[PDB]
Amino acid sequence: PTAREENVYMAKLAEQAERYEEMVEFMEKVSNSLGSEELTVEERNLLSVAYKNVIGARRASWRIISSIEQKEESRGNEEHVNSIREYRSKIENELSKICDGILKLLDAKLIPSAASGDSKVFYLKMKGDYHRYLAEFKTGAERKEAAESTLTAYKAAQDIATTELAPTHPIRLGLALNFSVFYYEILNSPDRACNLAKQAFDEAIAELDTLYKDSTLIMQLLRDNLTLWTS
Amino acid sequence: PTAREENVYMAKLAEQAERYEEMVEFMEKVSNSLGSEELTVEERNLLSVAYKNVIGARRASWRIISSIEQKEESRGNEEHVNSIREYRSKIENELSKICDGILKLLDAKLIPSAASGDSKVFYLKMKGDYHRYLAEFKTGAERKEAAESTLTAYKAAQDIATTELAPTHPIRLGLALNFSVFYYEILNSPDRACNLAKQAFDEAIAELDTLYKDSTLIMQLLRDNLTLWTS
Amino acid sequence: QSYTV
Amino acid sequence: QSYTV
Ligand SMILES: C=CC(C)(C)OC[C@H]1O[C@H](O[C@@H]2C3=C([C@H](C)COC(C)=O)C[C@H](O)[C@]3(C)/C=C3/[C@@H](COC)CC[C@H]3[C@@H](C)[C@H]2O)[C@H](O)[C@@H](OC(C)=O)[C@@H]1O
Ligand SMILES: C=CC(C)(C)OC[C@H]1O[C@H](O[C@@H]2C3=C([C@H](C)COC(C)=O)C[C@H](O)[C@]3(C)/C=C3/[C@@H](COC)CC[C@H]3[C@@H](C)[C@H]2O)[C@H](O)[C@@H](OC(C)=O)[C@@H]1O
Structure with missing residues (x-):
């Protein structure tokens, strides 16, 4: 072997x-x-x-x-x-x-x-995720750059996911989940967070309606966060 | 401080x-x-x-x-x-x-x-416990000595617990629980194990009857093992 | 905190 | 295995 x-x-x-x-x-x-x-x-x-x-x-x-x-x-x-x-x-x-x-x-x-598209969104998401984990505890200028790095990685990930993968794709669905959490918890922008979360969830339901336990769970998370943030 | x-x-x-x-x-x-x-x-x-x-x-x-x-x-x-x-x-x-x-x-x-009595049974029990953890994976002559060491520590612990502590005492109750598990799982002697477990449980109930969430849980374990081993 | 994957 | 504490 x-x-x-x-x-x-x-x-x-x-x-x-x-x-x-x-x-x-x-x-x-x-x-x-x-x-x-x-x-x-x-x-x-x-x-x-x-x-x-x-x-x-x-x-x-x-x-x-x-x-x-x-x-x-x-x-x-x-x-x-x-x-x-x-x-x-x-x-x-x-x-x-x-x-x-x-x-x-x-x-x-x-x-x-x-x-x-599959692996590119996957790795770009990880990139954002870990700069985000940094941003959670950092504070001064360190926080600002961890935040900037997070945003760059997620946006780069989103460009590819939006065009190359289905709205029902779990990587893309997870990218939305995390990216929206980034807005809500690091950028303290519940507005931008809810829009994104809602939009990704809706597009999934849409695609699902017209034309995966994997994606179903992630969507349940997007919803739990949406309701959660509406408080 | x-x-x-x-x-x-x-x-x-x-x-x-x-x-x-x-x-x-x-x-x-x-x-x-x-x-x-x-x-x-x-x-x-x-x-x-x-x-x-x-x-x-x-x-x-x-x-x-x-x-x-x-x-x-x-x-x-x-x-x-x-x-x-x-x-x-x-x-x-x-x-x-x-x-x-x-x-x-x-x-x-x-x-x-x-x-x-409290700390002596406590430390002597730990001694047996860890020689027991060794005995769980050891096999040859290593197992035999881990077993011998376990038995010595538990017996020394029992002598003190039997005389100096109440049958309802959690240290003593835990010593019985472990010591009986030692008989059942390392010495493969379900007979000696059940006797001990049953005896310690009974003495506790007795004392309790005539004259602690702490001890109640340990007793529940002694019972679960007794019923468990009766299969 | 919020749910992430 | 059996229960211990
Ligand atoms: C058994 C262990 C491994 C090999 C890790 O698999 C775990 C899981 O691996 C896959 O799921 C991925 C996956 C997870 C799913 C959301 C789990 O969902 C369910 C219902 O089990 C959790 C993991 O962290 C993982 C790998 C990660 C991600 C994450 C990647 O960030 C860069 C964002 C999206 C998501 C994708 C890659 C999911 O497809 C599968 O689609 C899962 O679904 C099935 C069939 O149960 C399986 O449980
Ligand atoms: C909060 C953490 C610490 C300080 C470790 O306490 C945990 C626990 O510490 C004490 O419990 C001990 C104790 C345990 C109890 C059986 C837990 O029972 C309940 C209902 O919570 C578990 C621990 O491993 C510990 C310390 C260990 C032993 C063990 C010692 O081996 C040498 C055999 C007997 C047993 C004795 C010492 C117990 O008294 C207390 O009597 C417990 O009871 C109460 C009031 O809830 C508390 O939860």
């Missing part, structure tokens, strides 16, 4: 065992493995599910800590706040490193190899 | 953020911190909940992998089996290291400082 075939099998084991840092490493090998061709749908998906879970943990930890820090600083208790933030820094450094590894992999290998 | 006070607060943060390796490190500091006195009930509990979660993850990963390996070897597929086991080795090395760190801490600091 080929080496690439092994790493893939290994990554699927890492996933079952829920050791995502390792699942990332394996798919990271398969990535840097081939040069001419691009990752299969399964491989491309395993790579982001892996990163998604690695970043997702620190993101959850970050929210908990951040939430606690808030409650404590508004309690006046300062001795705690310094320890909460000292801990948050640590969580944030990891988020930075995680985001950095996948962003570099996106520019060096992932994006250059996208030979279709 | 004292340093010890900080590590404790930090460990409770690590727990909330669910970063157990770190929660372990913090309580590990507080442990090596004081020498004369022993960890408080809260500290003693945070230390084992921390280790428990660190070991618990590798244990879950180990079961998944092991289960897969079984299905594959009985499928004849050997190329996979070699990768499954290669992965399992890795999980097992971590289990070994994890078990080693807490076992050494138990002998060097934890046990020597137990100034009461």
Whole structure:
């Protein structure tokens, strides 16, 4: 069996065992493995599910800590706040490193190899996603550039998705979901967010009406967010 | 605020953020911190909940992998089996290291400082627990000694619990739960296991009848195991 | 926060 | 496996 075939099998084991840092490493090998061709749908998906879970943990930890820090600083208790933030820094450094590894992999290998609308929107979305994860905790000029980077990646992703993929396509549907969340949570623009979310959802329903558990779930998320934001 | 006070607060943060390796490190500091006195009930509990979660993850990963390996070897597929086991080795090395760190801490600091029936049964139980976690994956002579060590620790724990603590005490109740699981799953002696489980449960009900959400849950586990093993 | 994929 | 604490 080929080496690439092994790493893939290994990554699927890492996933079952829920050791995502390792699942990332394996798919990271398969990535840097081939040069001419691009990752299969399964491989491309395993790579982001892996990163998604690695970043997702620190993101959850970050929210908990951040939430606690808030409650404590508004309690006046300062001795705690310094320890909460000292801990948050640590969580944030990891988020930075995680985001950095996948962003570099996106520019060096992932994006250059996208030979279709499917993978191009996919990788461009990831690009935006991780600059977004940065923007969630950054604040000063760092936030501004993470935001700018997010917007650029999502817009580039949207141009391709809007023309090359169906409104029912899950990648395109997910791009809309995230892009609209970006407007609502980082740009604090519920107007631009709702328009986008509503528009993508409507086009999906339209296409569906005239002429995938995959896309159905994403649409349910778009709706939950729409109703959610209408409060 | 004292340093010890900080590590404790930090460990409770690590727990909330669910970063157990770190929660372990913090309580590990507080442990090596004081020498004369022993960890408080809260500290003693945070230390084992921390280790428990660190070991618990590798244990879950180990079961998944092991289960897969079984299905594959009985499928004849050997190329996979070699990768499954290669992965399992890795999980097992971590289990070994994890078990080693807490076992050494138990002998060097934890046990020597137990100034009461409560903490002595507590630390002696942990000792057995981790030699048991070893026994779960070990096989040859390694298994035999992990088993012997488990039995010694549990028996030593039982002598103290039987005389110094109430049958309703959660530490003692948990010691019975684990000790009986040891008989049933490592020593494959459902007879000795059921007797112990049944006996501890009965004594609890007795005491309860004549003369704690804490103990109630443990008793529910003793019962679930009793009914479970009666199949 | 909001739902993303 | 069986329940432990
Ligand atoms: C078993 C693991 C792997 C290989 C990762 O597959 C998980 C999933 O992989 C595919 O789903 C993708 C996919 C996800 C779906 C939304 C899951 O939906 C359902 C109903 O299971 C979650 C993942 O994060 C993943 C790979 C990611 C994305 C995301 C990519 O960002 C760059 C935005 C869109 C979305 C696309 C790629 C989805 O097609 C499939 O279409 C899913 O559907 C089926 C048949 O159940 C399967 O569960
Ligand atoms: C909040 C976190 C910490 C500080 C770890 O507390 C968790 C828990 O800590 C205590 O419970 C212990 C305890 C556990 C209880 C069985 C949990 O029960 C319930 C209903 O929540 C689980 C933990 O692993 C812990 C610390 C461990 C043990 C275990 C020790 O092995 C050496 C065997 C016996 C058992 C004892 C020590 C229990 O008393 C309390 O009695 C629990 O009860 C209450 C009031 O809810 C609390 O949830």
